[PDB]
Every structure is written in structure tokens, then in C-alpha cells.
Amino acid sequence: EVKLVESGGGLVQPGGSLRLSCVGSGFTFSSYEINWVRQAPGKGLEWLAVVSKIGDRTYYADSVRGRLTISRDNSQNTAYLQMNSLRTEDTARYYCVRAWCASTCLPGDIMDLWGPGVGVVVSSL
Amino acid sequence: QTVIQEPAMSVSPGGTVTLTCAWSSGSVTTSNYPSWFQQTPGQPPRQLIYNTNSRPTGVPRRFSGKISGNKAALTITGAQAEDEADYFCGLYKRSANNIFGGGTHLTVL
Amino acid sequence: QTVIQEPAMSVSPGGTVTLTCAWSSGSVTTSNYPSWFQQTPGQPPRQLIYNTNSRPTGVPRRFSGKISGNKAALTITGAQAEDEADYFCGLYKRSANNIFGGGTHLTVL
Amino acid sequence: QTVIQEPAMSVSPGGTVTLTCAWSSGSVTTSNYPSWFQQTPGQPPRQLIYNTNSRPTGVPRRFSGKISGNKAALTITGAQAEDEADYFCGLYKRSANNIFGGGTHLTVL
Amino acid sequence: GAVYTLVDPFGRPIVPGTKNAYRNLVYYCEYPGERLYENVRFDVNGNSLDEYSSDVTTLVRKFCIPGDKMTGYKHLVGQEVSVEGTSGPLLCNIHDLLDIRRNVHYSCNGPQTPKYYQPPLALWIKLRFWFNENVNLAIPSVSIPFGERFITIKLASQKDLVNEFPGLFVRQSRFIAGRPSRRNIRFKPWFIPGVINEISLTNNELYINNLFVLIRVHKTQVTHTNN
Amino acid sequence: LDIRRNVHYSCNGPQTPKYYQPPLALWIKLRFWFNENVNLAIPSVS
Amino acid sequence: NHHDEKLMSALKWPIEYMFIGLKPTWNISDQNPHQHRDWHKFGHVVNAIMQPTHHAEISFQDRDTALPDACSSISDISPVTYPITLPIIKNISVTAHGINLIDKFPSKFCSSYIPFHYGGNAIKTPDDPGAMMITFALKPREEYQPSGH
Amino acid sequence: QPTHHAEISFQDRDTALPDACSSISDISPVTYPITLPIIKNISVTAHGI
Amino acid sequence: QPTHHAEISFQDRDTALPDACSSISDISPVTYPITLPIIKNISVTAHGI
């Protein structure tokens, strides 16, 4: 029943911008935090970004600080990720994950339900 | 600073396997909060263990977490054929938050 | 982020008027500390109310403050001819400190 | 902001001398933690007094520390011929940590 | 925000999962000397003349035993007594329409205090009969033979005398985020019953005042009611 | 060293300030000159 | 040590109920810091100390929030001292001229039970277990008549 | 359940509502045993009276 | 007026004088009522003695 399906990703040239939109259904999206996590095809997971419950208090990762800007709209139950600049390293499957507080509160400790994943394939060709 | 996992082990069905993850430098304190994730290919990763010994609802009882020596260990007792997946360890460093491992592909023979 | 007032209100002498100030986005929590100031033209602004319900010495009893719904309200009961001035509301946002409104020119007919 | 010392004093053997160090602006509070150091020429500096009145092991009993007025004072009672050295005062400012003085060349006649 | 740790009742950590670290603290029941003699009867070739229980003993404790001898009875039957201590000088105030004053506290170290290792305890239970009140009404030892006089007591069970205290507490820190950011830390006991070691009754004696040279028999009964 | 319990005292009675004081049973003794000795109790027929 | 037989010759008159107390010499000694507090105590005095701290745990980060970022252990200036009078005698004994009389009675017997049963309302039980009594009459204060000596 | 409440402020600017609090309870709560009455109206009736 | 004193330091560098304190008092202060003596020298004089 509960889902975090997302879309808005595709093949883009390097040094470009992308708009990833993640929608949620049937789990009161305004009350739970949502994070964005990167998984490289062979280099394991990597946590990218956090937006809090209200929409403010955004804290990113060290490797993508400033490069990625996250946003949240609780009216239509959406979380947006802006990839303002993209190198060739950023080709990966991006997941929007629901994560509430167990020990570490705002970065999230229990990533309960993961989105199906959207594949960003940056390429100069 | 990064977390390292070994590339792979193989386990017989019904056997016990112990995956290990560790910091590149230093010890894995319980304040680093290891979290183990399972990703079946073609499926999103699932939360297996958070805070080194606790399991969210829906996780089978066979998964256990511990910290042994200076590393974190995921022990599967009586592993089934559904455990053939990619297993990731993530440690919470104070500045860099969650740092995830390369991934250990558990092979169920 | 800014605070908005309605730009003009009219009150009869001896009448009650309720000026409102509100955040552009979000609620006006009592921890945002509304402060209402009166500026007679040709005169510096004077502090009427601080901390939503308190009055410094010299302020007349008729000025009352409250927080109604999701906004802050200045109620003048029995307004005299000396209240025809500009009225500014200021909210203490956590990072930007005091942010003041555009100003409402209260007209005493 | 810096700490200032007088450049030199002279003391007779067996006599009492009072060396002063002071902030350029403001007072020398006990929370600024004066620390007095002795450096014989050809030798590294040695910790005489830390936290305005305390002496590490090996320091002779004759070196006493105090705070007088708005400055810190090192009192040497019955100074010997081994005290002819450079004496440095260091104050712990909150942001700049330890700030050391120019240096007093105490002359034992 | 809730994070759980295992702590000893004195605040010492337990490192959960470690075998042979949690040991339960043990009580004694309040007034062990009363509960030990659960049923006392006196027989002269059968035909029990006097028979009472622990409830008669606690009734005559509540009514007949004076307050001056209350500490004596509490020491005899093994009840903890309140030791009074003092804290020290304090600021205080004097409001009349300033002075130095000491604070007095009470604490207990006796049997009913939950302890890891309860010391061996001395029970001196008085036996109450009709002839134990007046020396003039004391029955002779020569009127009837001494062989036929017998005393039968039903001692209580070990589970009826010794209880256990939870020797492990789940300590819950909880960070309630916001302004203010509260940190409520509570403790919930972890009570799993263990096996108390068997109590060995040592130096079981009866002290009889055999001095050298109408009656008031107390009739007791016990009834159970559910109306 | 030794494990020791701490003893406190508390009051729940009438003098405790309460939002709602329960109904209370006063049994006030009456003291006179003839209430002490049963031999000095005055007759009801004299 | 372990056997302390003391004989007296001053007692010649018949003896009724007798209070005896074995006070440690350290109780009234000058070297005792608690000499003034523990002088009137016929048992071995020790001190159980409350050191009641004011523990408070504060977190700063609003992100890690599992182990607190700082704590506090403010103790009171004057710790609370309870004086405990542990018993000083294990087996008391009073032997007469020809008969055994009192032989190896425990101190709890002579300190608690004998004040509890013998004496009536006029004799109370002392709180200190070191103080005890040896009885010689059935009616110590119940009547003004010698009932045994 | 006697807690150890302590309120700490961090900013030195806002300083009206505290920036953090604490509610450290004791491990063993204080238990007073109250003996509420069990009988409302006792009665002992004789053979004839 | 039993306060709950707690001293907290933030910096992890200065750490000698605390960076914050707290003095949370209880709501109801504890009031011991003391009966100081009312009479210095009482006297009852008879008719003749």
C-alpha cells in the first residue's frame, strides 16, 4: 500500500541540471522525513541529502554539499531534488527513502521503505 | 575516511555466515551505529539492522547483529535461498553522517 | 521570509480597531515575539507592546496585544485622536532577528 | 589585542621583585589564566606558574603568582643568581587562546 | 528518539548479551518472624488446647505491643528500623509577620532492603499462649507429665519469606526534538525470576524460662468471605 | 559498600492541598468530669 | 580477645534487673572525628554516606541525539551521614558463684527480647543493640516488692 | 518519580525559551503503600439483641 | 528552596568555568513551622506566699 515511487531522471549531458520528484501515497508524507540516497552500479550506497518534516532544516553530504539542493512540498506530497551541476561520477540509481528517528534524528536511522529507484546516466555522448 | 567490506563470501543453505564491515582507520564503536541493508537484485535495498542489534518489523529472526573486536558483524543462522543479495554496512561518522560500504554479494549455494 | 500587514485601517473615535500582522509563510508562534510600534509623523517610533502582551511604562492602557489564529493582533479600545499614526509589527525570526512590517496607517475619523 | 610587559627590571640577590603583565585593553580576569614562564638563555622556557597561583612539580617555592588591580604579578622573594632569565606572561583569551608577552629580562645584581 | 541501555539498579552499565552479569536483588518479607510461624498449636496427648496463626500475631502486634517496644519487636522478628542521619548546614530563611538549619533524612539497611547478598538473620519469635501473661497463672511442670506436652509449628515456604527485586533496569533516553529539546530519561525494571538458594535453618532452639519456686484463653478463627 | 534503602514520608490527608477534598468523618470526643471513671459516671435516673 | 572474663567484688547487695552497656573506647576517644556525635552509643559506629548528585544530560547537535553531548554530576556540599551502631557483642554471659546463670546468650536476646518482655511500660527497648539488660526478677517495675534477686 | 530538571540555553541571544532541558528520573521510584479502608459499616449482632 | 543545579560546558576547549548553569527550583518551597518560645519567666503568685 505505502509507496515512494519517483520519476524525473534520464540521460543528461555533464554539467547540467536534473529535477527528481518523489511522490508518496497513503503514509501521511507530511509527518515523516524523506532522504535521497545514491547507489553506484558497483561502488555501493551513498547518502546524498535530507529534508526535514516541515520542509526547512536541510543538511547535505560532504561530497555533494551545495551541488544538490533538496526541497519539499507537503501539499501534493512531493520531494524534489535539484542536481544543479553533474560530473560523470554522478551516474547512479537514486532512491527517495522514508526515514524517521531512532538514534540519529534528522539524518535518519531507520530507512523503512525505499523507492524503486530512478537511474541517472550522465554521459558526454 | 571510509568503511570497507570484503567483496564476497559463499554460504551453504541452512548454514551460518558472518559478514564483516570495518572502518579503514580506527575502531567501530557502538556510537558509530552500524546499519546493515539487504538489496535483492532488481529490488530496492531493505533495512535489515539498525543500531547494531535491532531489527525493524518484517525482518526475519535469523539475522543478528553484533560488534566483534574492532568491526561490525552480521550473522545469518540457517540462511535460506532468499538471502542471495548484496549486503551493505553503513557507519554513522559524526561529521559525514552515514557512510556505506562497497557491498558484499552473499552467494547461497 | 517577511511579515505582512494590511496597509490601511479606519477607526471612529472611541471605537475598537484590531490591526493584524502575519508571517508570509507559517504561523506566528508566541516564540516569534511580536512587537508593536507606533510612529506619529514627525516623531520617532515608540514601543507600544513587546512579547505580545506586555507594555512598557508610559504606554496607555488601551493598547492590548494578542495572538489570534495564526497572526498577531493589536487591539485599540476607545481609540482617541492621538492614535492616528503608523503602526509597525515586528517578529523575531530565529536567524534574522527582528523583522518589521510595512506599516499600517491608522486613520481616526 | 595583545599582552604588554615592561621591558626590564633589576633585583638585588636575596631581594623581592614584582613583575607585571597586563592586557592592552581591559582587565586581567582570573578566567584569562595567566601563565608565567622562565627561559634561561641557551635553555628552553620552563613552566613556572599556571592558573595564576599554582606551580608544577620542580618549581621552587619562591615564585608566587597573583592578580593585582587589573594586571598579573609574579613575585620572587629571596631571588637567587639562577633567576637571571627571560620571564614571559601568557593570557588565555577566549578566541585567540594563549597570547604571550614580549619578555622581561630580570637582572640579578 | 528513544535509545535503550541496560543499567544496574545503582546505575552501572551491563553491556547486554553478556552471560552471568545480571543477578536479582532479594527481599525479605516485612516481619519475617510473624510469617515464619504460620500456624502454632500446643498439644497435650492430642486435643490441641491453643492454636493460632500469623494473623493473630500481627493483630496483637498492631494492638497490644506498645510503641516504646516497637523497635524491640522489629529487631526480634527481623524488621528494618529507620536509621536517622543528617545532611549538613543549609541557607534557609525566616519569615515573620537567615538561620542555619540541618536537614534530617531516614534510611534503612535492614532485611527488607533489597540486597545482592542478604546476611544470615536472627529470628527471635515470641510464643503467645494463655499462660504466658501472668506468672501466677503459669501452669506447673509437675501437674501433668512433661512428655505429653508438644508444640507443632507450620513453617512458611521460602517463596513466602523471600521475594526478589529487579536487578536490571532498562534505561530509556529520549530526545524530544524542538525548542526546548527535552531529554527524558526513564527507567523500567527488567524482572525475570531466578532460583533463590535454599534457606538453611541454623541454631533452631526454643528458649524456655524454667524458673525455680481464672485463665484467659484466646479463641481465634479464620474465615473466607466473598459476598 | 553496603546496599541501603532510603525512607521518605508523605501525606495524603485533609491538610494536603487538594483540588477536591473528599467528605470527611470527624469523631470528636466530648470531655467532661464524669467521662473519666466509670464509677463516677452520673446516673440517668437521679 | 575472644574471651573476656571480668570479676567484681563491689556488688554485695542483692541485684534486681541490670542494664549493661559495652561502649567502644574509640567512641569517647579524642582521636575520633565523630566523638561528639557517637559518644552515647554502645555499639561500633560506622557512617553510611549519601552523596546525592544532581544528574542532568544535555544534547547540543539536534542530529546525533542518542548519547548526550554533555552531562553533569553536581553533588551537595555536605554529604548525608547515617550513623550505624553495629553490635559489639556476639555472646554475652554472666556466670554466678556456683551456677552457670547466663551462659553465652546472644546480644540480640539480651538487648531486644528482655527489654521487650520484662519491665512493663516503664522500661523501653533501646535503639542501640550494644546496650542490653540481664534480668533477675519477674516484676522489675510492675510492683514495689522484691520478686527475685 | 522525582526527576532532576535542568534547563540550559546555548545562544546567549534568544535566551527566553531554553535551548535544551533534562528530565533525569531516579532508577527506583518511591513507593508509599496506602492502606485504604476495607469496611464501610461493621456490625456484630448477638443472639437476641 | 531546593534547586536542581547543573553545570554544562559546550566548548570542549576552555572547560574550567562552566559555559552554562541552571537553578531550577521546586514550585512549592518546603515550609517548616517552628514554635519559638513565648514566655521567658513564668510566675504564679499565691495569696500570701
Residue numbers in the entry:
A (entry chain D): 1 to 125
B (entry chain F), C (entry chain L), D (entry chain H): 1 to 109
E (entry chain B): 152 to 248, 304 to 419, 435 to 448
F (entry chain C): 304 to 349
G (entry chain A): 449 to 597
H (entry chain B), I (entry chain C): 499 to 547
From the paper:
The outer icosahedral capsid is built from 8280 major capsid proteins (p72) and 60 penton proteins (H240R), organized into 12 pentasymmetrons and 20 trisymmetrons. All four classes of antibodies recognize conformational epitopes that comprise 2–3 copies of p72 monomers, locating on these exposed regions (ERs).
To define the epitopes of antibodies and expound the characteristics and the neutralization mechanism of the antibodies via structural analysis, we determined cryo-EM reconstructions of five antibodies (B1, F11, C9, H3, G6) in complex with p72 at resolutions of 2.75 Å, 2.98 Å, 3.48 Å, 3.24 Å and 4.36 Å, respectively. Except for G6, all other antibodies have three copies of Fabs bound to one p72 capsomer, where three B1 and F11 bind on the triangular exterior of the p72 capsomer, constructing three vertexes of the “triangle”; three copies of C9 and H3 associate with the triangular interior surrounding the three-fold axis, occupying three sides of the “triangle”. In addition to ER1 and ER4 from two adjacent monomers, the class III antibody epitopes, e.g., C9 and H3, include extra residues on the ER3 albeit with significantly decreased residues on the ER1. Authentic virus neutralization assay revealed all mAbs could partially inhibit ASFV infections, among which the class III antibodies (C9 and H3) had relatively better neutralizing activities and G6 exhibited weak potency due to low occupancy and affinity. We found numerous clashes between antibodies (B1, F11, C9 and H3) on adjacent p72s in trisymmetron and zipper, and also a few clashes in pentasymmetron and zipper. These four antibodies have potentials to cause the dissociation of the capsid as a result of the mechanical forces generated by steric clashes.
